[PDB]
Amino acid sequence: LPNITILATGGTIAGGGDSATKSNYGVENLVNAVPQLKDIANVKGEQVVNIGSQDMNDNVWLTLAKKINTDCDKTDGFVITHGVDTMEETAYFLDLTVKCDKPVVMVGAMRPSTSMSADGPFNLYNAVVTAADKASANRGVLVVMNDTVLDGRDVTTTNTTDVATFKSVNYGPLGYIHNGKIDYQRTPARKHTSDTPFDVSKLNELPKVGIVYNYANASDLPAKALVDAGYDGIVSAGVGNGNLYKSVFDTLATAAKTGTAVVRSSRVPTGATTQDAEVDDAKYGFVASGTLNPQKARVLLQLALTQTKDPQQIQQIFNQY
Amino acid sequence: LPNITILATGGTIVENLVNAVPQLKDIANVKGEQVVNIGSQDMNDNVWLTLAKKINTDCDKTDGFVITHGVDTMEETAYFLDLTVKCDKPVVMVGAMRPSTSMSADGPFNLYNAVVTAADKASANRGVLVVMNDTVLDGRDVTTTNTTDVATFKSVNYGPLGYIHNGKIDYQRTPARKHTSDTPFDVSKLNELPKVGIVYNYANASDLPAKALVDAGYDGIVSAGVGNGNLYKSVFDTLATAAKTGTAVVRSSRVPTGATTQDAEVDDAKYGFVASGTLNPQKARVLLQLALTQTKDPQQIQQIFNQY
Amino acid sequence: LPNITILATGGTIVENLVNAVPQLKDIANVKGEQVVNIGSQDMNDNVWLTLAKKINTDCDKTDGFVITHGVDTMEETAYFLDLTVKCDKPVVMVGAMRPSTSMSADGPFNLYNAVVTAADKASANRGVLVVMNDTVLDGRDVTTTNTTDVATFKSVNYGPLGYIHNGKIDYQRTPARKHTSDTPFDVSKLNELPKVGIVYNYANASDLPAKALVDAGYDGIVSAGVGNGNLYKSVFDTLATAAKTGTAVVRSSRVPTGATTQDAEVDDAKYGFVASGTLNPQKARVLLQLALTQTKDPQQIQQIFNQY
Amino acid sequence: LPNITILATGGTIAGGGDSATKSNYGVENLVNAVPQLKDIANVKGEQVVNIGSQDMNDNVWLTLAKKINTDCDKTDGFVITHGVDTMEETAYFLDLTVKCDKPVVMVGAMRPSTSMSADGPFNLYNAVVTAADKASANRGVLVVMNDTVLDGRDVTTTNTTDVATFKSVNYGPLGYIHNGKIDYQRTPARKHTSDTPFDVSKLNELPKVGIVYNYANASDLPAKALVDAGYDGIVSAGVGNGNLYKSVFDTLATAAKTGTAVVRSSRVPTGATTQDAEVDDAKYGFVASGTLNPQKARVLLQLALTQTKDPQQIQQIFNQY
Ligand SMILES: N[C@@H](CC(=O)O)C(=O)O
Ligand SMILES: N[C@@H](CC(=O)O)C(=O)O
Ligand SMILES: N[C@@H](CC(=O)O)C(=O)O
Ligand SMILES: N[C@@H](CC(=O)O)C(=O)O
């Protein structure tokens, strides 16, 4: 049986409340909770941090990537237990920075461990299956939830409470898990892991990138505040195909001319923010995010900014990764 | 044949755009008025006020309304009108994903189907409607789901009201939440709305956007939360402060479907916060601005979030 | 606390299966009866008749019903009950995608949420319901969408009625089509139903299935059509014959969402055919069997397809 | 500009009615209808047949595959105009039998050419874009509809009237088309085209394979009728995960023992009909269809039957193609 390391970070997978009914709510304990894991793997757990993923942050990301990269040779695969709220952000960061070519699988739960029909046990089982499968390697960093293997780039949470929330809403899943076996029919084409130039091994921190939302009568104050604090990048959560309210547009145009990287994404939950629509990016020094949602576009923008501040180079990164 | 008024506001879709679909004459007597002409990314409170007042004033002059509008913020305008319109004649919003000069432009048939909807007596008393891609959608739940797809508009939590085939609608649903003349929001004498901003949550979220709104003395802030409406620690600290300091706080979610619930990880009562339910952040803004015309009490705001 | 009766029929989910969720005692007084014990792939007309009669008889003895049932044909049974049940107390169907012995079994919480639904006074007068994966779904539109996913059950055309969170339901919709005591189907004295078969369309489709049904003198045939209810040429020839010869013909579709419409490629009137609307083939069967208890006239059958 | 051949077969793309409003309803004419095609390709049209796709049949399939295979060297790509009703069946047949390694793209329309906001013109444009793109080769046979490139295996029609009906409901699309450009992020892993052993070049007909539906109180008469006519194969459209009503089960078990190939699929619109569920396939001589829906499982079963009648070999084909 393969050796699989679980790196725990917290999340509802590790949460609990006073009741198995009511909605209000350690890695050794999790493992003992799923004894069946011994049928499939030799499991070792490490608790890396213990936070709700609503409090996920750059340092946790750097700590995870460096640890995976450092421990690659000591294990056959990793499982990361993580909250659902920002799982899609961490998974993409790891998909761009991990250089290990063993599976890295993220997993969480939508119901607390203490609740009736808790999804965490079987999710964890399925994540270990995935991390153990030789066919899971070279697919990038993965998320496994509700019997489905999802690529770290496209995966996002679609519903606030549904156990089936995680979907790759633009390009679909990679494989489905039945009876402990995966039929893989897809692999992401965008470059990942050892095919990216991002190397976080020596980094102590990440460039500052903020996100602003667009809607009717949007205030420019959020954007101005990021500009005044000297943010390296700003991502716009645009309306429709990446459009901005005028006041927001004017602040971001000015910023871009002072060297602030500006990426247009969309608050719309699927589809690409495209070039050659209503915004002349080349003219303003803006970058179109493609299918990257605003939180995901931030991940790439941060990493882009460790290599270049040039908008045209940043656009090329947004076309390749 | 019914009398239908088209109010144009702009968008990728008013005499010329009428004339172009001569089949409209088969189903209605159409009169066109240009209210404003803007990309719907520049939609604002003033346009909203103008529209509600115009429909409310002109209600007995016509048998229904069609509003042509850009796709980007259609779901915001529809819900604003849904809460402020007192006319119980059909009000139908329509736009287009493809330019009118493009191959297979969606605008013409969309306009046709919107007029079909506005002229159907069965469409009345269903609140403000959005008609796109052969489907009638309620103004509260409707939202744009893809950046380019002609099928983008969906009612992602509770589904459509009816589908349009061969110029007829089989309606099987109507919105239970109170709308139009069952709301107390009356905008007939207002010239501005309360100031409500939206801030985004994500890993390592800056508190600076939320701080800038609080420093400007905004009347409300809506959080586009992570998961079930949760807040990055910095953001939560700054909002905890706002809520006790004169700024109403509504937790919504950046997640595209499902409710931001009470009784999850956030003690709303302790902090003075309101849970948005199924209202996404831009929708929650609409209802929060209108709640703030009536009250500033977070308990009363939460009750409004529970009924409209 | 309400009195709730659980009727068990089998499935991958009645004293033992009760006792296993001791939290039920927090919300209801539950009484259990085993009606039959089968895999729902073997569901049949007799079980359906038994259930309708039992609910209709026992209606004043309890405050609501929960039917435990396999997933495979749940959507057929729910719609049959939806049309034949005259009790206006909640009737809620529930099953499980995963075995009760499996890791993260869905059955326990599903049962809990079904009892929550059956006990809610707001659930009454909404027709027969299916409660799965935190969602209340109307018996007419509900269907199983994936072969293994715990989230399989969806109302794919008109959406759910309500979502269940923390033991409470926010209902925002109710089915407009007539159900339960607004139907004329009365099954209280019947011991069998009319014979209705389903045939599939695809390229190079054999007419032999349809012929074998016609040769047996079936009372109806439902076509699982291609696209908008269309028929392979051989199949159309044989059905054209059936419809004039004593066998009612309903065009449905193998396509998983959307209506089989009138006024498309098939002259329904000329052939004596009925268009199913949104009813998929197994659902159309249910309504056709029940129409055939009242009439054999294709015009009257089409009217029934337009109201229920 | 590339040379692109359009092979027309009919469909609503080539339909019409008396009105642009009402719902009731040649390849040279189609082409002249989309003058913009000259900006992207040198288009030549051939009318192969002219039928509604509800009347699609084995001979049309054999004629198409042999013509593509024969004309491969005379053109840079094919577009096939086809009705929507059975497009998903023809596309899979072609995905298994075409040996040409130039793009083969299928296209149709949901609204008639004569109707307001007719989808056919832009769909045809987008299909030619796709057939012209060098990156579209080696992806198998494709369907292009509503700005989306879909693989012939997973693609199916999901709605009776919606222009956006075509989706790859299990594994997602291959790429999206904006402004005449495709960003491809996926390719099907199942073996297709020149990687399959199916060779239809000399075939005059195809093995007989019928489909039976399962529901409550299902009659066994449909199945018995296929059995009595000596059908080479039967596909079951099962309930839930491929289950059968008892009467249907007994007839198909008996058949299988007389050498009839029996494949279990599902009437459920997504997800695999799996092995190791409630049916012991190895015991009855049955084959599980996987993600293949009943009409798609028929396509593969027909072709399987040109090579073998052995259930275990047929199962292996159902695991590879
Ligand atoms: N707030 C939790 C949500 C979950 O895990 O379900 C987290 O992200 O840590
Ligand atoms: N930017 C346009 C988008 C569209 O209508 O397609 C608008 O909202 O006006
Ligand atoms: N075959 C089972 C499927 C399930 O319930 O999961 C049944 O319908 O009884
Ligand atoms: N019956 C038509 C449907 C369409 O093309 O839209 C066909 O398949 O030929």
Side-chain angles (χ1 to χ4, degrees):
Chain A
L1 303 180
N3 297 324
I4 298 298
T5 303
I6 301 177
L7 309 174
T9 72
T12 305
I13 193 163
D18 269 49
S19 175
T21 283
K22 291 176 56 174
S23 60
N24 310 67
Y25 71 83
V27 75
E28 181 197 74
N29 296 342
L30 175 102
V31 163
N32 287 309
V34 195
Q36 298 87 351
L37 294 178
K38 59 114 175 169
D39 305 330
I40 59 184
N42 299 314
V43 172
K44 191 198 84 173
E46 306 185 45
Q47 192 74 50
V48 176
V49 292
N50 181 42
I51 56 172
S53 78
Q54 64 268 52
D55 293 336
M56 194 49 58
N57 63 67
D58 300 353
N59 196 64
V60 173
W61 290 355
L62 289 172
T63 303
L64 287 169
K66 295 169 180 180
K67 178 160 186 74
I68 289 169
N69 288 335
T70 297
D71 295 357
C72 186
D73 304 321
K74 301 166 184 145
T75 188
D76 301 323
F78 302 87
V79 175
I80 306 179
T81 55
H82 186 294
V84 302
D85 296 357
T86 59
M87 170 111 78
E88 78 201 70
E89 304 177 41
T90 307
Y92 186 45
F93 177 86
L94 294 179
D95 200 29
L96 299 169
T97 57
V98 166
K99 307 295 170 186
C100 190
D101 264 73
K102 307 202 189 165
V104 180
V105 177
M106 302 197 69
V107 70
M110 293 296 283
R111 299 176 179 152
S113 62
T114 50
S115 73
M116 221 170 336
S117 296
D119 56 324
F122 195 48
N123 282 349
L124 180 60
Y125 188 84
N126 282 341
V128 172
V129 169
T130 304
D133 186 347
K134 269 182 211 100
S136 304
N138 302 110
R139 281 179 202 275
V141 173
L142 309 173
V143 176
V144 172
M145 294 290 277
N146 198 36
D147 313 348
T148 312
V149 190
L150 308 147
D151 86 273
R153 185 182 198 276
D154 203 37
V155 72
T156 185
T157 183
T158 61
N159 185 270
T160 54
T161 60
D162 188 336
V163 293
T165 180
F166 284 99
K167 290 298 200 303
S168 290
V169 291
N170 298 294
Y171 298 102
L174 303 192
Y176 291 95
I177 308 174
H178 185 256
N179 198 36
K181 295 177 310 212
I182 301 170
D183 183 20
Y184 276 117
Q185 298 198 23
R186 298 292 202 273
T187 197
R190 289 267 165 152
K191 287 174 164 174
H192 60 249
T193 56
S194 56
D195 292 326
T196 91
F198 310 115
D199 175 354
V200 307
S201 56
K202 298 288 160 49
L203 287 178
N204 196 248
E205 15 60 31
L206 266 14
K208 281 165 195 135
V209 176
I211 305 184
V212 302
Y213 209 71
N214 288 259
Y215 49 101
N217 217 111
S219 182
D220 62 15
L221 297 176
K224 289 175 141 114
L226 298 176
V227 173
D228 295 346
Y231 265 56
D232 306 295
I234 300 176
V235 169
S236 171
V239 297
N241 187 1
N243 288 318
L244 304 93
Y245 188 71
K246 187 171 179 222
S247 313
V248 179
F249 201 142
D250 295 337
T251 295
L252 295 188
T254 302
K257 165 52 102 257
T258 77
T260 307
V262 173
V263 169
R264 294 189 307 105
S265 189
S266 182
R267 74 183 195 181
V268 177
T270 79
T273 296
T274 71
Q275 298 180 70
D276 295 314
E278 300 181 50
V279 188
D280 183 347
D281 294 311
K283 198 225 271 193
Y284 296 98
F286 299 161
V287 166
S289 72
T291 63
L292 300 171
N293 72 24
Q295 55 270 17
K296 282 191 199 258
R298 165 178 181 275
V299 168
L300 188 56
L301 184 52
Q302 284 186 304
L303 293 164
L305 286 160
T306 70
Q307 309 228 328
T308 180
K309 313 215 67 120
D310 178 71
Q312 236 169 324
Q313 290 177 170
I314 294 177
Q315 187 69 75
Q316 265 299 296
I317 283 164
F318 273 72
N319 294 350
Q320 286 181 88
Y321 307 104
Chain B
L1 291 205
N3 294 329
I4 295 303
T5 305
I6 299 172
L7 307 182
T9 66
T12 304
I13 199 167
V14 77
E15 186 203 54
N16 302 129
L17 266 141
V18 158
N19 268 280
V21 190
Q23 297 69 35
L24 289 175
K25 291 175 297 85
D26 303 344
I27 58 163
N29 309 298
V30 336
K31 171 152 88 80
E33 302 180 66
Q34 193 80 34
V35 166
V36 289
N37 200 301
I38 56 169
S40 88
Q41 65 274 39
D42 296 315
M43 194 51 58
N44 60 62
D45 294 353
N46 291 152
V47 180
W48 283 1
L49 294 165
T50 304
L51 288 167
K53 293 169 174 177
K54 198 189 209 334
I55 292 151
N56 283 339
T57 299
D58 286 359
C59 186
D60 45 35
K61 305 185 174 90
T62 184
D63 301 312
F65 297 91
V66 169
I67 307 171
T68 59
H69 192 290
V71 164
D72 299 359
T73 59
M74 179 130 68
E75 72 199 73
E76 304 180 45
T77 305
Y79 188 41
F80 176 87
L81 295 175
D82 203 22
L83 297 166
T84 54
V85 166
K86 308 305 174 168
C87 199
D88 266 303
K89 295 182 196 169
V91 178
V92 182
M93 306 197 64
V94 63
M97 291 303 279
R98 295 172 184 159
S100 49
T101 37
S102 63
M103 261 175 282
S104 295
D106 54 323
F109 195 46
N110 280 344
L111 184 57
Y112 185 85
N113 278 341
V115 169
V116 168
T117 303
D120 186 351
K121 69 202 232 260
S123 300
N125 285 102
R126 289 189 193 264
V128 166
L129 301 172
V130 168
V131 167
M132 293 291 282
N133 189 44
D134 309 354
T135 313
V136 185
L137 304 151
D138 74 276
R140 186 181 193 272
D141 199 36
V142 69
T143 189
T144 187
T145 62
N146 187 268
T147 51
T148 65
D149 189 343
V150 296
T152 178
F153 281 98
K154 291 293 205 295
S155 283
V156 293
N157 300 294
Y158 299 101
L161 307 190
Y163 293 93
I164 313 174
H165 180 263
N166 198 29
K168 293 174 299 204
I169 307 173
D170 180 19
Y171 275 113
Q172 301 201 19
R173 291 296 194 273
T174 198
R177 287 283 168 128
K178 286 163 180 188
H179 61 249
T180 59
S181 48
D182 297 319
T183 93
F185 313 114
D186 177 349
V187 139
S188 58
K189 284 161 266 303
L190 300 176
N191 288 328
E192 60 204 46
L193 298 166
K195 301 202 302 173
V196 176
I198 306 183
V199 294
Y200 206 70
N201 293 83
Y202 50 100
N204 216 117
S206 182
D207 65 11
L208 296 169
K211 289 181 145 162
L213 295 176
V214 172
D215 287 346
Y218 265 50
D219 297 303
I221 301 171
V222 174
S223 174
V226 295
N228 185 0
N230 291 312
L231 312 161
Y232 183 70
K233 74 176 117 175
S234 306
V235 190
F236 198 153
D237 292 343
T238 295
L239 301 175
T241 299
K244 303 285 78 147
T245 296
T247 298
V249 171
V250 170
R251 302 189 300 105
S252 183
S253 178
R254 78 191 186 174
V255 179
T257 76
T260 293
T261 72
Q262 316 190 47
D263 300 306
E265 297 173 63
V266 177
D267 189 342
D268 287 307
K270 175 179 180 179
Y271 297 100
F273 294 164
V274 167
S276 74
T278 62
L279 299 174
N280 68 32
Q282 53 273 21
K283 292 203 192 254
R285 168 170 182 277
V286 169
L287 181 59
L288 183 54
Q289 280 186 303
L290 287 162
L292 287 169
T293 73
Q294 306 252 313
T295 181
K296 303 153 177 255
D297 179 63
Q299 190 184 333
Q300 288 182 315
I301 297 175
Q302 178 66 74
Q303 216 51 256
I304 280 158
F305 272 71
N306 292 345
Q307 290 167 84
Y308 308 99
Chain C
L1 291 205
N3 294 329
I4 295 303
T5 305
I6 299 172
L7 307 182
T9 66
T12 304
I13 199 167
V14 77
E15 186 203 54
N16 302 129
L17 266 141
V18 158
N19 268 280
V21 190
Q23 297 69 35
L24 289 175
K25 291 175 297 85
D26 303 344
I27 58 163
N29 309 298
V30 336
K31 171 152 88 80
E33 302 180 66
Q34 193 80 34
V35 166
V36 289
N37 200 301
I38 56 169
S40 88
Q41 65 274 39
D42 296 315
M43 194 51 58
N44 60 62
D45 294 353
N46 291 152
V47 180
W48 283 1
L49 294 165
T50 304
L51 288 167
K53 293 169 174 177
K54 198 189 209 334
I55 292 151
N56 283 339
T57 299
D58 286 359
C59 186
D60 45 35
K61 305 185 174 90
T62 184
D63 301 312
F65 297 91
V66 169
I67 307 171
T68 59
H69 192 290
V71 164
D72 299 359
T73 59
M74 179 130 68
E75 72 199 73
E76 304 180 45
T77 305
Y79 188 41
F80 176 87
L81 295 175
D82 203 22
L83 297 166
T84 54
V85 166
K86 308 305 174 168
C87 199
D88 266 303
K89 295 182 196 169
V91 178
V92 182
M93 306 197 64
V94 63
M97 291 303 279
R98 295 172 184 159
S100 49
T101 37
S102 63
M103 261 175 282
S104 295
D106 54 323
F109 195 46
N110 280 344
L111 184 57
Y112 185 85
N113 278 341
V115 169
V116 168
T117 303
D120 186 351
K121 69 202 232 260
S123 300
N125 285 102
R126 289 189 193 264
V128 166
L129 301 172
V130 168
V131 167
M132 293 291 282
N133 189 44
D134 309 354
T135 313
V136 185
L137 304 151
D138 74 276
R140 186 181 193 272
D141 199 36
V142 69
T143 189
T144 187
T145 62
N146 187 268
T147 51
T148 65
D149 189 343
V150 296
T152 178
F153 281 98
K154 291 293 205 295
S155 283
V156 293
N157 300 294
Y158 299 101
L161 307 190
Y163 293 93
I164 313 174
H165 180 263
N166 198 29
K168 293 174 299 205
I169 307 173
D170 180 19
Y171 275 113
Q172 301 201 19
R173 291 296 194 273
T174 198
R177 287 283 168 128
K178 286 163 180 188
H179 61 249
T180 59
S181 48
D182 297 319
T183 93
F185 313 114
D186 177 349
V187 139
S188 58
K189 284 161 266 303
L190 300 176
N191 288 328
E192 60 204 46
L193 298 166
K195 301 202 302 173
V196 176
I198 306 183
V199 294
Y200 206 70
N201 293 83
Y202 50 100
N204 216 117
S206 182
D207 65 11
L208 296 169
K211 289 181 145 162
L213 295 176
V214 172
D215 287 346
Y218 265 50
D219 297 303
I221 301 171
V222 174
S223 174
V226 295
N228 185 0
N230 291 312
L231 312 161
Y232 183 70
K233 74 176 117 175
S234 306
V235 190
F236 198 153
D237 292 343
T238 295
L239 301 175
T241 299
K244 303 285 78 147
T245 296
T247 298
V249 171
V250 170
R251 302 189 300 105
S252 183
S253 178
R254 78 191 186 174
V255 179
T257 76
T260 293
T261 72
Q262 316 190 47
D263 300 306
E265 297 173 63
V266 177
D267 189 342
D268 287 307
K270 175 179 180 179
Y271 297 100
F273 294 164
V274 167
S276 74
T278 62
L279 299 174
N280 68 32
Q282 53 273 21
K283 292 203 192 254
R285 168 170 182 277
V286 169
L287 181 59
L288 183 54
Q289 280 186 303
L290 287 162
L292 287 169
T293 73
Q294 306 252 313
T295 181
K296 303 153 177 255
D297 179 63
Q299 190 184 333
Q300 288 182 315
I301 297 175
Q302 178 66 74
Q303 216 51 256
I304 280 158
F305 272 71
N306 292 345
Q307 290 167 84
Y308 308 99
Chain D
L1 303 180
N3 297 324
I4 298 298
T5 303
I6 301 177
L7 309 174
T9 72
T12 305
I13 193 163
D18 269 49
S19 175
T21 283
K22 291 176 56 174
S23 60
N24 310 67
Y25 71 83
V27 75
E28 181 197 74
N29 296 342
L30 175 102
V31 163
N32 287 309
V34 195
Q36 298 87 351
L37 294 178
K38 59 114 175 169
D39 305 330
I40 59 184
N42 299 314
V43 172
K44 191 198 84 173
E46 306 185 45
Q47 192 74 50
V48 176
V49 292
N50 181 42
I51 56 172
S53 78
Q54 64 268 52
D55 293 336
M56 194 49 58
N57 63 67
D58 300 353
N59 196 64
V60 173
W61 290 355
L62 289 172
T63 303
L64 287 169
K66 295 169 180 180
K67 178 160 186 74
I68 289 169
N69 288 335
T70 297
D71 295 357
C72 186
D73 304 321
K74 301 166 184 145
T75 188
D76 301 323
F78 302 87
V79 175
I80 306 179
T81 55
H82 186 294
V84 302
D85 296 357
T86 59
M87 170 111 78
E88 78 201 70
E89 304 177 41
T90 307
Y92 186 45
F93 177 86
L94 294 179
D95 200 29
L96 299 169
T97 57
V98 166
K99 307 295 170 186
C100 190
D101 264 73
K102 307 202 189 165
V104 180
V105 177
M106 302 197 69
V107 70
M110 293 296 283
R111 299 176 179 152
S113 62
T114 50
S115 73
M116 221 170 336
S117 296
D119 56 324
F122 195 48
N123 282 349
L124 180 60
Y125 188 84
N126 282 341
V128 172
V129 169
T130 304
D133 186 347
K134 269 182 211 100
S136 304
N138 302 110
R139 281 179 202 275
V141 173
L142 309 173
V143 176
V144 172
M145 294 290 277
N146 198 36
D147 313 348
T148 312
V149 190
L150 308 147
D151 86 273
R153 185 182 198 276
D154 203 37
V155 72
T156 185
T157 183
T158 61
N159 185 270
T160 54
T161 60
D162 188 336
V163 293
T165 180
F166 284 99
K167 290 298 200 303
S168 290
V169 291
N170 298 294
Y171 298 102
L174 303 192
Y176 291 95
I177 308 174
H178 185 256
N179 198 36
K181 295 177 310 212
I182 301 170
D183 183 20
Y184 276 117
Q185 298 198 23
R186 298 292 202 273
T187 197
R190 289 267 165 152
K191 287 174 164 174
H192 60 249
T193 56
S194 56
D195 292 326
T196 91
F198 310 115
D199 175 354
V200 307
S201 56
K202 298 288 160 49
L203 287 178
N204 196 248
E205 15 60 31
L206 266 14
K208 281 165 195 135
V209 176
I211 305 184
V212 302
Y213 209 71
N214 288 259
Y215 49 101
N217 217 111
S219 182
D220 62 15
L221 297 176
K224 289 175 141 114
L226 298 176
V227 173
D228 295 346
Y231 265 56
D232 306 295
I234 300 176
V235 169
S236 171
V239 297
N241 187 1
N243 288 318
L244 304 93
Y245 188 71
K246 187 171 179 222
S247 313
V248 179
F249 201 142
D250 295 337
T251 295
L252 295 188
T254 302
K257 165 52 102 257
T258 77
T260 307
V262 173
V263 169
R264 294 189 307 105
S265 189
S266 182
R267 74 183 195 181
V268 177
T270 79
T273 296
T274 71
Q275 298 180 70
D276 295 314
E278 300 181 50
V279 188
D280 183 347
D281 294 311
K283 198 225 271 193
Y284 296 98
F286 299 161
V287 166
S289 72
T291 63
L292 300 171
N293 72 24
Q295 55 270 17
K296 282 191 199 258
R298 165 178 181 275
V299 168
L300 188 56
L301 184 52
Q302 284 186 304
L303 293 164
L305 286 160
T306 70
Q307 309 228 328
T308 180
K309 313 215 67 120
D310 178 71
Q312 236 169 324
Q313 290 177 170
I314 294 177
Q315 187 69 75
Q316 265 299 296
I317 283 164
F318 273 72
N319 294 350
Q320 286 181 88
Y321 307 104

